[PDB]
Design a binder for this molecule. Structure first.
Ligand SMILES: O=C1Nc2ccccc2/C1=C1/Nc2ccccc2/C1=N\O
Length: 273
């Protein structure tokens, strides 16, 4: 029994160390452990139905973050749906993903590590978690899968940009349709090649600012054409394709914002609540 500042707090469900827990009255979750204090300050700034809420903290000579409980993550939903999800659902999950991320961006914060397991869903409704690598606007930055990273980041971009999360939302959007990860580079060095092998290699003519990126000067890349959206995501509705393509364009200045994406005609039929 560990004393928080709000309450006293039990199965083991952890990784990477997360437990399940009982309040003196409600079910919570306990994340055990630098990037933790960060996570508190950032999470206090982020109160939103689509961001997993932090309810308490326990300090011992190990930090424990007390969170609202969440049945599962999207990593697990994709294992029950190996060929993708129902169009009704993709729309729902995607929309909530955009709503959480939009809230972050309005509040000058970037998740920077969006991926299915960092998206928790409760049995009712999906929420962003794990702000360990989040970037507050103006504060300097201080293992992982590279499958959802923006190509420009992978190429050495250091600049603050909301576009970085939209790339990740794109890869997740695509993953929900096929059931499979869009850019599963076999090693870390294969990630950019993998990306280009599907979306085509970017060219300086259309996107003049690759040339200014640190890994573009230090490396040449095999030149691919884009694979038609027809073979990447067979049979998906045109509206969806349009949206995904606007999430996945190479030029961070052309890439759609979370808020704009919420207004896309693909979301014509969904209740915005
Ligand atoms: O309910 C939760 N709220 C969280 C907030 C932050 C991180 C995790 C969780 C979390 C988790 N719930 C789970 C249920 C089964 C297996 C793992 C987790 C888990 N995490 O592994």
């Amino acid at each position: 029994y560990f004393q928080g500042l709000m309450e006293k707090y039990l199965e083991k469900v952890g990784e990477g160390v997360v437990y399940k827990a009982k309040d003196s009255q409600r079910i919570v979750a306990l994340k055990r452990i630098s990037t933790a204090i960060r996570e508190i300050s950032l999470l206090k700034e982020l109160h939103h139905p689509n961001i997993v809420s932090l309810i308490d903290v326990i300090h011992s000579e190990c930090l424990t973050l007390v969170f609202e409980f969440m049945e599962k993550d999207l990593k697990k939903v994709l294992d029950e749906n190996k060929t993708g999800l129902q169009d009704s659902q993709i729309k729902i999950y995607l929309y909530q993903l955009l709503r959480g991320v939009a809230h972050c961006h309005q509040h000058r914060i970037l998740h920077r590590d969006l991926k299915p397991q960092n998206l928790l869903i409760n049995s009712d409704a999906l929420k962003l978690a794990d702000f360990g690598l989040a970037r507050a606007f103006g504060i300097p930055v201080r293992v992982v899968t590279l499958w959802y990273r923006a190509p420009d980041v992978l190429m050495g971009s250091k600049k603050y940009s909301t576009s970085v999360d939209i790339w990740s939302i794109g890869c997740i959007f695509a993953e929900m349709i096929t059931g499979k990860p869009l850019f599963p580079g076999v090693t870390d060095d294969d990630q950019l090649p993998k990306i280009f092998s599907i979306l085509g290699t970017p060219n300086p003519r259309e996107w003049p600012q690759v040339q200014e990126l640190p890994l573009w000067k230090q490396r040449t890349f095999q030149v691919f054409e884009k694979k038609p959206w027809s073979s990447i995501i067979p049979g998906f509705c045109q509206e969806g394709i349009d949206l995904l393509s606007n999430m996945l364009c190479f030029d961070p200045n052309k890439r759609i914002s979370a808020r704009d994406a919420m207004n896309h005609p693909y979301f014509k039929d969904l209740d915005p609540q």
